[PDB]
Amino acid sequence: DPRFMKKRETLPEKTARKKKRLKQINMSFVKKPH
Amino acid sequence: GWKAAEKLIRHWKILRGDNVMIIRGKDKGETGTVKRVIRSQNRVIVEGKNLIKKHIKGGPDHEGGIFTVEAPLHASNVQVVDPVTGRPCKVGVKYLEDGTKVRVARGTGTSGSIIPRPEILKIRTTPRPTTAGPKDTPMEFVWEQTYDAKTGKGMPDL
Amino acid sequence: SLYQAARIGEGDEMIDKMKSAGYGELLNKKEYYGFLKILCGIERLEHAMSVF
Amino acid sequence: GSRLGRRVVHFANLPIKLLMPTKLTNIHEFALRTIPSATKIEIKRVLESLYGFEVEKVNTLNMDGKKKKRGGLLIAKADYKKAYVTLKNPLSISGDLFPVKFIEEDRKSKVKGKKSHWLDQKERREVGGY
Amino acid sequence: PKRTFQPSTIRRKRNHGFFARKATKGGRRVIARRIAKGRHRVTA
Amino acid sequence: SFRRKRASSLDILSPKRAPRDFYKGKNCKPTGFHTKKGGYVVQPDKLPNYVIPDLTGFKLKPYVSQCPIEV
Amino acid sequence: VKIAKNPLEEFFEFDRSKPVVYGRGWKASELRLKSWDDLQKLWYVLLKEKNMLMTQRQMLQAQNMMFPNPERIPKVRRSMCRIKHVLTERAIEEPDPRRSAEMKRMVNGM
RNA sequence: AUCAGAAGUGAGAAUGCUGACAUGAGUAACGAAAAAUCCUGUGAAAAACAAGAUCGCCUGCCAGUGGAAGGCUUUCUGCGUUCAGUCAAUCUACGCAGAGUGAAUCGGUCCCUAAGGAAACCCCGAAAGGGCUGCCGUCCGAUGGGUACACGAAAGUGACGA
RNA sequence: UAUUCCUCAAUGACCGAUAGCGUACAAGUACCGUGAGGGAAAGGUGAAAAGAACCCUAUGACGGGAGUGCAAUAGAGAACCU
RNA sequence: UUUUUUUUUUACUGUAAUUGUGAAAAGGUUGGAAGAUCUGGCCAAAGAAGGUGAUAGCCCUGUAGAUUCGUUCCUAUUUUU
RNA sequence: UCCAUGGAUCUCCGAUCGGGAAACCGUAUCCAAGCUCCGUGGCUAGUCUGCGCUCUUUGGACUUUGAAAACUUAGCGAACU
Ligand SMILES: [K+]
Ligand SMILES: [K+]
Ligand SMILES: [K+]
Ligand SMILES: [K+]
Ligand SMILES: [K+]
Ligand SMILES: [K+]
Ligand SMILES: [K+]
Ligand SMILES: [Mg+2]
Ligand SMILES: [Mg+2]
Ligand SMILES: [Mg+2]
Ligand SMILES: [Mg+2]
Ligand SMILES: [Mg+2]
Ligand SMILES: [Mg+2]
Ligand SMILES: [Mg+2]
Ligand SMILES: [Mg+2]
Ligand SMILES: [Mg+2]
Ligand SMILES: [Mg+2]
Ligand SMILES: [Mg+2]
Ligand SMILES: [Mg+2]
Ligand SMILES: [Mg+2]
Ligand SMILES: [Mg+2]
Ligand SMILES: [Mg+2]
Ligand SMILES: [Mg+2]
Ligand SMILES: [Mg+2]
Ligand SMILES: [Mg+2]
Ligand SMILES: [Mg+2]
Ligand SMILES: [Mg+2]
Ligand SMILES: [Mg+2]
Ligand SMILES: [Mg+2]
Ligand SMILES: [Mg+2]
Ligand SMILES: [Mg+2]
Ligand SMILES: [Mg+2]
Ligand SMILES: [Mg+2]
Ligand SMILES: [Mg+2]
Ligand SMILES: [Mg+2]
Ligand SMILES: [Mg+2]
Ligand SMILES: [Mg+2]
Ligand SMILES: [Mg+2]
Ligand SMILES: [Mg+2]
Ligand SMILES: [Mg+2]
Ligand SMILES: [Mg+2]
Ligand SMILES: [Mg+2]
Ligand SMILES: [Mg+2]
Ligand SMILES: [Mg+2]
Ligand SMILES: [Mg+2]
Ligand SMILES: [Mg+2]
Ligand SMILES: [Mg+2]
Ligand SMILES: [Mg+2]
Ligand SMILES: [Mg+2]
Ligand SMILES: [Mg+2]
């Protein structure tokens, strides 16, 4: 049976990484109660 | 009016239940115990210190009048009391023989003893219910076993 | 049916119950070959050799 | 197995939210809310198989979600589907169940503002729509 | 008097719709220009 | 639950706010086929079948009890 | 009192009285000990409970009344997620190709 | 401070730009020759609101019934008067909250084509593209023709003006 | 050798809410146009909300006292430093 | 087949340890509150920066570094028709 | 709670299976191979063989390349002044 036989970052990835860092920077400050 | 670009404190050397001394403010020079830590404002509440007077209007549910509760202090306004000499001291990090993190007294003039982690932390804020509810499975039924891959117990309807 | 459903322990225990019920003369080579064909078609080779 | 049918569902997840009827006795139909991608045959078969209803007919209609617009800012709720199910035999709802009595008592607060003949029926079938 | 805007939804979609703009080379440049500007309503 | 949308999402054409021959639909699965006379024929093999086992006498419950028993 | 007389009485909480207490949800380690029949029966029990809770929330909100204990709904919802994850985990571990491809359809089918 | 350095360096006027505030002025006006009057009630306040009585206006293109095009919750019930209404409004197409639209036959979807549009093949053209829809030929397009299987056609037809 | 739809770090005799990007604030938004297209406005209580319990006069406190606070013309509901 | 293990040592924008560790004393006066002023000790391969009730090197988070982890190498990825 | 790594689920348009008023509609692709279950036909009747589909595995048949600012190389190429 032929089953039991043994056998750089893209621009969207850089954009997702930058977006996550942008959220993480906003979440680093003291929240203003309101 | 929170105009300052103040960052959060990520790792707290101040724990709920610790014994501190207020070093700055209206109640400077007075000792107490930490009741609650407000992390999102970098503030703490000392038990019975830094009081304020609130004018609360009472409706059909809550009672009115002028109450008196504690107001938060900044987390850099308190300082942990050395357990030996009783004077406030700084907190450093020491590794034990296992490799367990502890808090040790730091500062010239201090004993360098271990700041004990308070015992109030292990006690639950919301205690467990005494009695089960009418839609709760008793623990003798959950722990029984009906699936076993080696003997093929409980296989589907294939 | 239990061998097609891959309930090997219950099928073995049903074999033993049919033995103790006085019907064991019915297991000729044909029905054991049928059980082996079922188990090999559902890929249970260790239990197939146990049944063997 | 797979020879039984082309569409066989073992784990249904159709959400059904019942609407409280006006009367407590002699209920001939009831209404419910569900997701917009449900079909009359799906609702009838789920209600028959899961709960044990005796369904006669199912009538549906679509609704838009509630919206609020304040000049540029828009907030909204999800769209839903409303279904009317007609029963073969009348059913009833007890008063002692929460929150039936509160619903009736709050409903009656908003709405504050003999000659029987021979062969006259008492409990007649009250079904609306087409 | 009879004003100039007399509405008709099918005419609006047949002149300024997404697949009406996508059909010719000028409308494809219109769609690219709108997306580059950042409009919320790319098509009519 | 109220959630935020864009105000430009009101411009997307819906059959509630369209001329009388506009048809969109709500992604329901089909159950048959259209006829040449404007009708419909429901093919019974495409209807869903539900396999709901008998739940009477079941001992498990929606929640798990949280009484203090042991560490 | 304690048992519904109609299918219509199953959209109501008949045992609600004295604060009523509800437990936590099922964990995956506790679900990994159960058979397929018990897991299917538990799925349908949780489905009926979820229908009751959503009906109760809608009925109470329709008269400007608060929904008591809203945390019951996510417990049921995440328990129902864990059941499907456990069944798919078994369907991966099934060694026969046809049986695994049929168990995945039995789980994910709709 | 002093002594030096770099300049987006000094306002009264460009029928200059933006904002704020005056004058005319408590002046014109309160928008179709149908029209109002009174008892009671609610309210802090009633010519304008609720209910009732008396009078008038519209009846084949301002005024009645159903609904196409467009609008998109303006519909109904409770609460309210900050905004809007040519009001000092208790009322409302106004704000808050909830509810409401049920189809084998109605109107669509579906089938078929017109005017028209587009692909394929072929023809032409610095590029982009333009033509061609048939001799064998495809997909859309109602303002029209159809309402209880599928396949085929050298059969009839559907089929029409003033 | 050319450029920056992009990433990381650093600098400024660069600007400081009619300035600096059109956008310090949920902006290519609201709004205008059939369409291509044009295109805004709007920053700040106080260290901490301790954001004024209670009394009097009005239909109604945003008023006059009382109280919190260093300070109350520092008393606001996309707006209260001078 | 698996597990334990001899396994060299530097470089690194590896802008690695999101946020790991990381030094440094007490008094007096004014002030709503001390970082201010007076007396007086200490750290610096750390006096870049931002907070805390006014202007803080020693109150807080960090910073220089030092330890830990991981890419090359030592330690050749070889053998078979 | 949180973090690192690996997993399970993973709606639709843009868009590419066909149609299209973008976010909708209709869709079991086709043909060889070998395997459990299924039903039916035929023999001299016992480890007898021969016909099918549904769904599963492995191949091969048709096609779906595809975006993007400036830079680069080419084609055509103004007018105000
Ligand atoms: K001027
Ligand atoms: K209409
Ligand atoms: K002041
Ligand atoms: K470091
Ligand atoms: K401090
Ligand atoms: K400092
Ligand atoms: K010239
Ligand atoms: Mg602050
Ligand atoms: Mg309908
Ligand atoms: Mg969204
Ligand atoms: Mg409509
Ligand atoms: Mg769809
Ligand atoms: Mg699913
Ligand atoms: Mg100048
Ligand atoms: Mg000037
Ligand atoms: Mg002038
Ligand atoms: Mg001017
Ligand atoms: Mg006058
Ligand atoms: Mg005059
Ligand atoms: Mg006049
Ligand atoms: Mg009157
Ligand atoms: Mg009236
Ligand atoms: Mg007349
Ligand atoms: Mg006319
Ligand atoms: Mg409205
Ligand atoms: Mg109305
Ligand atoms: Mg008014
Ligand atoms: Mg008034
Ligand atoms: Mg009203
Ligand atoms: Mg209204
Ligand atoms: Mg019809
Ligand atoms: Mg034609
Ligand atoms: Mg053409
Ligand atoms: Mg062409
Ligand atoms: Mg086409
Ligand atoms: Mg056609
Ligand atoms: Mg027509
Ligand atoms: Mg005709
Ligand atoms: Mg500006
Ligand atoms: Mg200014
Ligand atoms: Mg301004
Ligand atoms: Mg527009
Ligand atoms: Mg007040
Ligand atoms: Mg100030
Ligand atoms: Mg670090
Ligand atoms: Mg330090
Ligand atoms: Mg600093
Ligand atoms: Mg100051
Ligand atoms: Mg497509
Ligand atoms: Mg390119």
Side-chain angles (χ1 to χ4, degrees):
Chain A
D1 207 319
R3 297 192 318 116
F4 295 91
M5 53 87 72
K6 304 164 193 180
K7 165 90 178 53
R8 60 186 300 173
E9 289 184 355
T10 74
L11 196 72
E13 263 80 8
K14 281 157 58 167
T15 303
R17 196 185 87 235
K18 180 56 187 279
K19 189 186 294 180
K20 198 201 309 300
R21 190 176 174 160
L22 276 173
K23 176 183 174 169
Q24 189 181 0
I25 289 172
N26 284 317
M27 301 277 98
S28 71
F29 283 91
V30 168
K31 317 294 176 83
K32 275 84 70 179
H34 62 88
Chain B
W2 296 62
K3 290 162 181 184
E6 185 182 0
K7 294 257 184 183
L8 275 174
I9 298 170
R10 303 298 206 173
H11 304 271
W12 279 66
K13 299 166 180 173
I14 292 275
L15 273 73
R16 163 181 101 248
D18 276 326
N19 309 102
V20 295
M21 169 179 307
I22 312 173
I23 72 177
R24 192 176 187 276
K26 147 184 60 170
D27 275 335
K28 164 185 196 192
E30 291 186 354
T31 60
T33 301
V34 174
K35 167 195 263 208
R36 191 158 81 258
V37 165
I38 310 152
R39 293 223 171 178
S40 77
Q41 307 168 11
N42 295 342
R43 292 163 89 188
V44 292
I45 288 174
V46 179
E47 178 97 13
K49 308 299 173 187
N50 197 43
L51 301 175
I52 44 161
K53 277 135 79 174
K54 295 176 66 171
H55 310 88
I56 284 180
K57 169 179 262 302
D61 48 356
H62 182 62
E63 213 59 63
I66 305 178
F67 290 108
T68 296
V69 298
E70 305 113 329
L73 300 167
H74 203 263
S76 66
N77 280 18
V78 307
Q79 207 173 7
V80 178
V81 168
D82 201 300
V84 178
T85 183
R87 282 150 52 250
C89 64
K90 309 184 195 182
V91 164
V93 163
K94 182 175 75 177
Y95 273 48
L96 278 182
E97 193 267 327
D98 195 348
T100 310
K101 258 193 184 169
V102 298
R103 302 188 303 165
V104 292
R106 186 177 49 86
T108 288
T110 60
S111 70
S113 65
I114 282 186
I115 310 297
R117 182 182 171 188
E119 306 298 321
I120 201 169
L121 301 183
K122 292 179 183 288
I123 295 308
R124 268 172 82 105
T125 59
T126 74
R128 288 185 184 268
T130 308
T131 47
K135 282 196 273 292
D136 299 335
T137 304
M139 271 311 190
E140 70 259 12
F141 286 148
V142 184
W143 279 346
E144 78 183 285
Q145 183 143 12
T146 309
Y147 180 70
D148 198 356
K150 299 184 183 71
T151 54
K153 198 174 68 217
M155 285 277 161
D157 279 334
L158 276 188
Chain C
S1 193
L2 294 157
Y3 289 165
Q4 183 70 35
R7 294 151 71 158
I8 62 170
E10 306 177 308
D12 280 33
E13 200 269 331
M14 189 69 69
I15 282 188
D16 288 340
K17 286 191 294 182
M18 189 255 280
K19 286 292 186 70
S20 66
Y23 289 101
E25 60 261 30
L26 274 299
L27 287 177
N28 53 321
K29 52 196 183 294
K30 181 162 210 69
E31 303 155 10
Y32 266 118
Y33 178 61
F35 303 153
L36 288 161
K37 206 154 62 206
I38 284 177
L39 287 176
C40 284
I42 66 153
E43 271 266 3
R44 302 294 176 181
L45 195 46
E46 304 313 299
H47 198 87
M49 295 286 171
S50 167
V51 159
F52 188 51
Chain D
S2 198
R3 322 171 83 113
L4 293 199
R6 290 293 261 133
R7 197 153 151 214
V8 179
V9 185
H10 291 261
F11 299 88
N13 57 41
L14 201 60
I16 299 164
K17 306 142 66 189
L18 173 71
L19 284 154
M20 160 65 51
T22 298
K23 291 174 65 175
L24 292 191
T25 52
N26 195 28
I27 287 163
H28 273 277
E29 65 191 357
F30 60 94
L32 60 89
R33 292 182 183 174
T34 180
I35 56 172
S37 62
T39 312
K40 288 176 177 160
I41 184 75
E42 308 187 2
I43 295 173
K44 186 187 171 237
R45 291 197 170 189
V46 169
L47 285 182
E48 269 183 326
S49 284
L50 179 60
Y51 280 109
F53 281 103
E54 301 185 321
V55 187
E56 162 182 331
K57 226 193 171 189
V58 175
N59 283 6
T60 60
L61 60 87
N62 280 310
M63 284 281 182
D64 276 335
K66 269 179 169 159
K67 294 181 176 67
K68 289 177 71 42
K69 196 189 187 300
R70 279 88 67 91
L73 188 153
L74 180 79
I75 52 174
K77 294 182 176 182
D79 304 337
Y80 61 98
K81 170 166 277 183
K82 189 172 165 179
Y84 289 88
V85 169
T86 301
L87 305 164
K88 289 183 175 66
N89 298 294
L91 302 187
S92 293
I93 284 178
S94 296
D96 62 357
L97 300 180
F98 176 79
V100 171
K101 62 177 78 66
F102 300 98
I103 283 160
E104 313 292 327
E105 203 184 63
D106 198 86
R107 274 170 174 179
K108 57 180 91 170
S109 67
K110 308 296 212 305
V111 300
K112 291 184 285 190
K114 268 283 178 193
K115 282 181 61 217
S116 292
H117 277 304
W118 184 230
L119 275 298
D120 190 359
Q121 83 280 34
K122 298 190 179 191
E123 309 180 50
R124 181 177 181 170
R125 183 172 170 266
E126 293 177 350
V127 174
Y130 315 94
Chain E
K2 180 171 186 173
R3 296 306 179 201
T4 54
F5 182 46
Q6 311 293 320
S8 173
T9 313
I10 174 164
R11 285 189 147 159
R12 173 175 189 88
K13 305 295 280 186
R14 271 178 177 159
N15 298 5
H16 325 291
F18 185 73
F19 286 127
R21 293 234 177 270
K22 188 62 73 171
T24 46
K25 185 171 272 290
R28 284 197 286 269
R29 287 166 46 190
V30 160
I31 294 178
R33 263 203 309 274
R34 293 291 273 252
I35 285 173
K37 184 161 187 175
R39 307 302 291 247
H40 282 195
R41 296 155 192 83
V42 167
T43 195
Chain F
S1 199
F2 268 131
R3 266 174 196 103
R4 205 181 173 126
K5 315 220 306 189
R6 288 173 163 201
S8 82
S9 56
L10 303 179
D11 297 356
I12 302 164
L13 204 58
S14 173
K16 282 176 178 289
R17 300 170 285 273
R20 81 292 184 289
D21 44 357
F22 184 65
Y23 173 70
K24 205 163 186 178
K26 303 258 173 176
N27 283 110
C28 309
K29 296 208 65 84
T31 71
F33 60 93
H34 299 83
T35 68
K36 294 179 179 179
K37 279 177 182 165
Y40 200 77
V41 172
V42 173
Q43 279 161 354
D45 56 351
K46 301 179 78 173
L47 308 181
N49 284 291
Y50 296 102
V51 192
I52 292 169
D54 210 25
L55 294 153
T56 62
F58 199 43
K59 33 183 203 187
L60 300 181
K61 291 184 184 298
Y63 306 110
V64 187
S65 179
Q66 220 177 7
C67 283
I69 295 169
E70 293 177 350
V71 165
Chain G
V1 175
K2 293 179 179 179
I3 293 169
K5 294 179 179 179
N6 298 317
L8 270 174
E9 320 267 12
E10 269 162 302
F11 292 85
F12 296 82
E13 207 192 347
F14 45 82
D15 55 358
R16 182 155 181 107
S17 78
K18 38 182 76 180
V20 61
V21 62
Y22 305 94
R24 63 161 176 90
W26 294 78
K27 294 189 317 202
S29 61
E30 297 151 0
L31 292 172
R32 268 174 197 107
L33 320 166
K34 302 302 186 161
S35 168
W36 282 68
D37 171 40
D38 310 288
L39 282 193
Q40 206 190 14
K41 288 172 163 59
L42 192 51
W43 170 271
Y44 283 108
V45 159
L46 285 162
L47 182 57
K48 300 219 261 204
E49 177 77 9
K50 200 179 79 155
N51 280 347
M52 180 264 283
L53 294 172
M54 282 192 296
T55 313
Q56 177 171 125
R57 174 174 61 189
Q58 179 200 270
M59 281 186 180
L60 277 165
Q61 273 176 10
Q63 317 286 336
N64 296 114
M65 299 161 155
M66 294 300 293
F67 180 44
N69 290 282
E71 49 267 41
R72 299 174 288 175
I73 308 173
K75 291 172 175 176
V76 171
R77 211 180 45 220
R78 294 175 181 175
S79 301
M80 293 203 305
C81 170
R82 290 180 192 116
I83 298 167
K84 279 223 179 198
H85 192 279
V86 166
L87 297 171
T88 312
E89 183 175 359
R90 284 168 198 180
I92 300 289
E93 264 158 21
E94 175 90 25
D96 188 19
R98 195 195 325 273
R99 295 181 47 90
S100 182
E102 201 163 4
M103 282 153 69
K104 288 176 188 172
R105 193 164 56 236
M106 286 180 67
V107 171
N108 284 315
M110 194 176 287

